[PDB]
């Protein structure tokens, strides 16, 4: 949205820059004018021909006498044109490369200019600054915008007048030569605006319509995928694929009429064009046959016109381009505009001599910058004498640290004064402040450069002698020594991460080297090992004794040296004095020491669409018609102009204009009929197939074991959006490119075959100019993407030194020492300066020569096209032809270029699409096999079961695990914790085969009994249970699949699970729904319909899973109630965590790291002591607390 | 060249 003034946006331009942009601006005017002009002579051409062409078949009666006026008119005439085209040329070169270079030349100087100025004024904010701003946001602001700029202030200008001026001179040219034929195109001109607002309308209205109708089916794609294991557990597969296949069956439909529409709409539009075009030239026909305008003035005003309307399209962009660069330099300007209160940039302020060191603190009221919210410092009075070390303790709020904020004047205090010897600290320069003062931070910082440079950011100036008595001085000698490279031994973020300490050390070496008057250390020792603490310490204690400190840590072992202690209350300082005096005062400090003590490409899929052999050859058959169709324009305006040029006598004229102007119609609307029908065929192709895909995917996405689905590679969206990209993808590439791309080729075809079989050797010539001008035309493409790519390279190292400086700042302002990476920004910034210097050079003479081989081309046509040509018996209207059809197939060619990553994509999109729908599970349901035994009467026997579960083959969950629970008796499952209870119930389902170890049911071995069957004896119930969106009879009966459940039955579950008080209740009963949709109902609910749909089932085998998990008061009861009465009739396996309910059970079991540790009904395991009686004891100990 | 086919 904002914007900045056009004048101060280019205040970094000045002298060369200003010439430049004047002699850019002026240059690309001309190259703007250049063409159009070329236009203007195209009908002088025409001319020429066209009085030759009338003379010529005027005669009928004598030949050679032809041979004579004609060919020197053609000579001189031709000979003229042609000097003239060749004129352009050099012109439109020449104005090109001085447009581009001198543009980019200019871009490039001021870029560099506006980044070293940011960078500084980065760096010359105060921290109150930096506090209340991302600094992330801010390089990125910094990186971004500037490039943003560049591409505002670059070429684009220049383009942007160039296209002003085609659009200036082509109306003025179209207006000169006739007034009336622009008045005339001006009103189709709306009429062509009013139909692609139409089109818009449509393309806007799908959209959303489109967003509506998938969602419908991903809308089941996703609660089916997220309720997986309950439908596999329930095997409801089928269904889930049913109610899948058929919203797709809904989203095709939508698709076809999406299709139908899309593509009539197109059709009609193309007709409107053709009708509006081919009526204006008629129009022109006949202002021609009033002998009003000439045949080739026509031309030359419909094409200078059509090219400068064209040109304000073309011209827009560049608009934007500027506009957004003003926006991205605001908040880049506003940062450089900023002066701050303190600067430390400036020269200014006292420099104090033989400095004493003695402080004060005054009366100083403080808040960061939250501002009102919280005021830490209230009030504050303090003093420590020269030489002496004074101590900050404090409870909390780091109000303690505040004073060290302050004592660096990183922040002005709100009210009060901190006094530096008997000045004001805010008289004195900020720099030399800085420099006097010494700073030791809890956390340090090390800049990633050698040792002696991390040293040497204390002094530029310094020797490896300094260096080496300031480690030593800091005891950090040895440690380093022992490190290899000596001095020059690496350290930062990447690379060499060492000792807490260590680096302490090194920032106690920097901040030694600094000679400070005045130290400050906060918390330095605190957050470290203690070993080492003691060693820093003692370097601590050796950078004192020269000088005046200010020491706060949580450490009181470092405190009873100090001279003087000083506590806070609440910002308040109160205590004050030696040790033994504060430890007299029993005040917060005494209170505080008694505190603390897989690629592919193949067509497959392709075989897939094979199902409909028809729908594609139509399609086909129909756009090579299309691509046949496409060049018979060009073949009627040759003969339109051609014939008219050709014409002779006048007479016939007006007679066949007409003939033509109609079958030129006739050619529309017949291309309203193919064009429509490739579209919908291939449209309605695409919407079948799209289905087949995203059901096959689906089911065979249902047929993957659970195994696959705990995958952290494969996740419930990540599977919803795998579904819908690979699908859609593969439409894309199947779908309109391919029908563009034949009729693209039979365009061109056709084109070549007609321009072939009438030029001879002129279509030869062309063939070998355009290919070139083409293939220049790429070549460039990849230069600008190479030098593209390179620069990114250079300016990520300076944006790299940008971050490291930025993001470490509150560091560097303590260092000074900011004009150091201001020079490093500077020469990390001259290389790319350099490059884009080059950059300009290079962009010119690629533009330029990729213009003037087009217009130099354009000679080699008419010069080619006259004199040997014409000197032959070859003709002018077939000239026009051959021009129009080739150039016109070439630029039908483009689409394929244009055409070409969207394949890529769909391949590397249905390279997937494949192998998910190859990939078979070890255990899959839809296998017909397996016993289904006909015995009813469970049992469980778990013998010697070791499992570790796919995801994590880490730690084991069961090892050598045996169980056995007879029919018509509750097994209870007591476990210290885990899934070692729940891996029972989840490998009685089969959701895993164990490592080692079998499970038999009836005797039989699970693993070789069928999978659907044996889970269709399963009684499951889980802790949160899910419930689909439908009739809440549709969730009970959804416990029984393969047959419709009565309704009597899902009554006498729904009885059962005493869940009918709320089915009664409810306005809908039975019918009513749930799942969130349409209704909301809380845990007992949901949990009572978990036991009727598991107990509607009728089950052999009841399996609860902390069923009473979630739940709390009378709930809990009402549903063990249910739960018990649910039991007692079947096998159950009862893992719930309530032991007290757990009280009556056949048999308890303990399990123990896998193995079962304790066994046996509840008075054994409580005349037995050990770990069951510590869970029912232990458990009893809060319910003895709640009474 | 414009739109038609030349």
């Known amino acids: 949205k904002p914007a900045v003034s056009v004048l101060t946006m280019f205040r970094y331009a000045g002298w060369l820059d200003r010439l430049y942009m004047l002699v850019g601006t002026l240059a690309a005017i001309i190259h703007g004018v250049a063409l159009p002009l070329m236009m203007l002579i195209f009908g002088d051409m025409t001319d020429s021909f066209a ?59 001021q870029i560099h200019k506006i980044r070293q100025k940011f960078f500084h004024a980065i760096m010359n904010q105060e921290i109150g600054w930096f506090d209340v701003h991302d600094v992330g946001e801010l390089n990125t602001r910094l990186t971004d915008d500037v490039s943003k700029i560049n591409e505002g202030i670059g070429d684009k200008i220049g383009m942007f007048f160039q296209a002003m001026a085609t659009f200036f001179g082509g109306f003025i040219i179209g207006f000169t030569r006739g007034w009336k034929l622009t008045l005339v195109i001006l009103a189709i001109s709306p009429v062509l605006g009013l139909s692609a607002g139409i089109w818009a309308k449509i393309l806007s209205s799908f959209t959303d319509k489109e967003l509506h109708a998938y969602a419908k089916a991903g809308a089941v794609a996703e609660e089916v995928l997220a309720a997986i294991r309950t439908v596999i557990a329930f095997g409801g597969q089928k269904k889930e694929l049913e109610r899948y296949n058929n919203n ?224 030593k001085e800091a005891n950090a000698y040895d440690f380093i020594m022992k490190l290899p490279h000596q001095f020059d031994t690496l350290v930062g973020e990447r690379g060499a991460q060492l000792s807490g300490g260590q680096k302490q050390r090194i920032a106690i070496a920097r901040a030694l080297v600094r000679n400070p008057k005045i130290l400050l250390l906060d918390e330095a020792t605190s957050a470290l090992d203690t070993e080492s603490e003691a060693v820093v310490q003692a370097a601590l204690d050796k950078a004192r004794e020269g000088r005046t400190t200010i020491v706060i840590a949580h450490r009181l072992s470092t405190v009873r040296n100090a001279d003087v202690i000083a506590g806070f209350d609440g910002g308040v300082i109160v205590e004050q004095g030696n040790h033994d005096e504060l430890m007299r005062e029993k005040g917060i400090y005494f209170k505080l020491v008694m505190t603390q003590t897989p690629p592919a490409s193949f067509w497959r899929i392709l075989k897939l669409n094979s199902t409909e052999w028809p729908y594609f050859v139509v399609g086909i058959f129909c756009a090579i018609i299309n691509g046949g169709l496409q060049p018979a324009f060009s073949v009627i305006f040759s003969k339109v102009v051609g014939v008219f040029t050709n014409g002779g006598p006048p007479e016939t004229q007006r007679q066949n204009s007409n003939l033509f102007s109609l079958l030129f119609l006739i050619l529309g609307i017949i291309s309203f009929i193919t064009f429509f029908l490739q579209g919908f065929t291939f449209g309605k192709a695409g919407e079948i197939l799209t289905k087949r895909l995203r059901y096959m995917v689906f089911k065979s996405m249902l047929r993957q074991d659970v195994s696959w689905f705990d995958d952290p590679k494969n996740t419930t969206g990540a599977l919803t959006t795998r579904l819908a990209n690979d699908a859609a993808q593969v439409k894309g590439a199947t779908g309109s490119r391919l029908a563009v791309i034949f009729q693209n080729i039979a365009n061109l075809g056709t084109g070549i075959i007609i321009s072939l079989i009438y030029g001879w050797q002129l279509t030869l010539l062309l063939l070998a100019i355009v290919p070139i001008i083409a293939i220049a035309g790429v070549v460039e493409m990849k230069m600008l993407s190479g030098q593209a790519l390179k620069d990114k390279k250079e300016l990520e190292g300076s944006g790299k030194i940008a971050t490291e400086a930025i993001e470490n700042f509150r560091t560097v302002v303590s260092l000074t020492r900011e004009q150091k990476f201001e020079t490093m920004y500077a020469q990390s910034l001259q290389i790319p300066y350099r490059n884009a210097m080059k950059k300009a050079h290079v962009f010119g003479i690629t533009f330029s020569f990729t213009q003037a081989m087009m217009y130099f081309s354009y000679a080699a046509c008419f010069r080619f096209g006259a004199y040997l040509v014409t000197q032959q018996l070859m003709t002018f209207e077939n000239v026009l032809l051959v021009f129009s059809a080739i150039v016109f197939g070439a630029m039908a060619v483009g689409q394929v270029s244009s055409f070409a990553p969207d394949y890529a994509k769909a391949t590397v999109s249905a390279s997937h699409i494949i192998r998910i729908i190859e990939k078979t599970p070890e255990i899959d349901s839809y296998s017909t096999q397996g016993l289904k035994p006909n015995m009813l009467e469970g049992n469980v026997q778990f013998s010697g079961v070791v499992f570790n579960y796919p995801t994590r083959p ?109 089915i009664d209740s409810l306005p809908d009963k039975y019918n009513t729904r749930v799942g969130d949709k349409g209704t909301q109902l809380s845990g007992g609910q949901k949990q009572r319909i978990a036991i009727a749909r598991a107990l509607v089932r009728q089950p052999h085998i009841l399996l609860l899973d902390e069923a009473t998990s979630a739940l709390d008061t009378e709930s809990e009861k009402v549903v063990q109630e249910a739960l018990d009465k649910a039991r007692e009739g079947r096998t159950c396996i009862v893992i719930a965590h309530r032991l007290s309910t757990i009280q009556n059970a056949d048999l308890i079991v303990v399990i123990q790291n896998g193995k079962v540790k304790e066994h046996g009904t509840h008075q054994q395991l409580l005349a037995q002591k050990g770990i069951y009686f510590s869970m029912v004891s232990v458990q009893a100990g809060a319910k003895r607390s709640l009474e | 060249x414009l739109x038609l086919x030349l």
């Not at chain 1, 003379?55 to 009928?60: C, D, I, L, Y």
């Not at chain 1, 000579?75 to 003239?84: G, K, N, P, V």
């Not at chain 1, 701050?340 to 104090?352: A, L, M, V």
């Not at chain 1, 205090?413 to 720099?431: A, H």
Request: charged share 20%; with cysteine.
């Open chain 1, 954 to 1062: 880490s730690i084991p969950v069961l090892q050598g695990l045996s169980l056995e629970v007879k029919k018509g008796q509750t097994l209870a499952l007591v476990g210290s914790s885990g899934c070692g209870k729940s891996t029972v119930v989840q490998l009685l389902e089969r959701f895993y085969d164990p490592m080692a170890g079998s499970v038999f049911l009836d005797g039989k071995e699970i693993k070789q009994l069928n999978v659907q069957w044996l889970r269709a004896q399963l009684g499951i119930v889980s802790q949160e249970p899910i419930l689909f969106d439908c009739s809440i009879a549709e969730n009970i009966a959804y416990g029984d699949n393969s047959r419709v459940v009565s309704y009597e039955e899902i009554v006498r579950a729904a009885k059962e699970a005493n869940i009918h008080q709320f």
């Open chain 1, 248 to 471: 797709l069956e809904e989203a095709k439909r939508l698709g076809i009429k999406k299709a139908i529409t899309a593509n009539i709409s197109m059709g009609a539009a193309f007709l409107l064009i053709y009708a509006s075009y081919a009526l204006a030239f008629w129009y022109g026909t006949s202002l021609v046959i009033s002998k009003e305008y000439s045949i080739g003035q026509v031309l030359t005003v419909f094409f200078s016109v059509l090219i400068g309307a064209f040109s304000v399209g073309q011209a827009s962009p560049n608009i934007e381009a500027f506009a957004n660069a003003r926006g991205a330099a605001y908040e880049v300007f506003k940062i450089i505009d900023n002066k701050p209160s303190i600067d430390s940039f400036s020269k200014s302020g006292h420099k104090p001599d033989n400095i004493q060191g003695n402080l004060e603190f005054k009366n100083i009221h403080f808040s960061y910058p939250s501002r009102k919210e919280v005021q830490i410092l209230k009030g504050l009075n303090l003093k420590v004498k020269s030489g002496q070390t004074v101590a900050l303790v404090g409870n909390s709020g780091c109000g303690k640290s505040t004073t060290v904020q302050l004592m660096q004047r990183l922040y002005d205090p709100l009210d009060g004064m901190v006094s530096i010897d008997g000045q004001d600290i805010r008289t004195i320069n900020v720099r030399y402040l800085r420099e006097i003062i010494g700073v030791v931070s809890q956390e340090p910082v090390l800049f990633a450069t050698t040792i002696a440079e991390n040293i040497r950011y204390g002094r530029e100036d310094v020797t490896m002698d300094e260096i080496e008595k300031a480690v």
């Open chain 1, 51 to 109: 009085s030759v062409g009338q003379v010529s078949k005027q005669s009928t009666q004598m030949s050679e006498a032809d041979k004579r006026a004609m060919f020197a008119k053609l000579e001189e005439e031709m000979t003229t044109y042609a000097y003239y085209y060749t004129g352009i040329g050099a012109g439109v070169l020449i104005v090109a490369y001085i447009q581009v270079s001198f543009w980019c030349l200019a871009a490039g100087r």
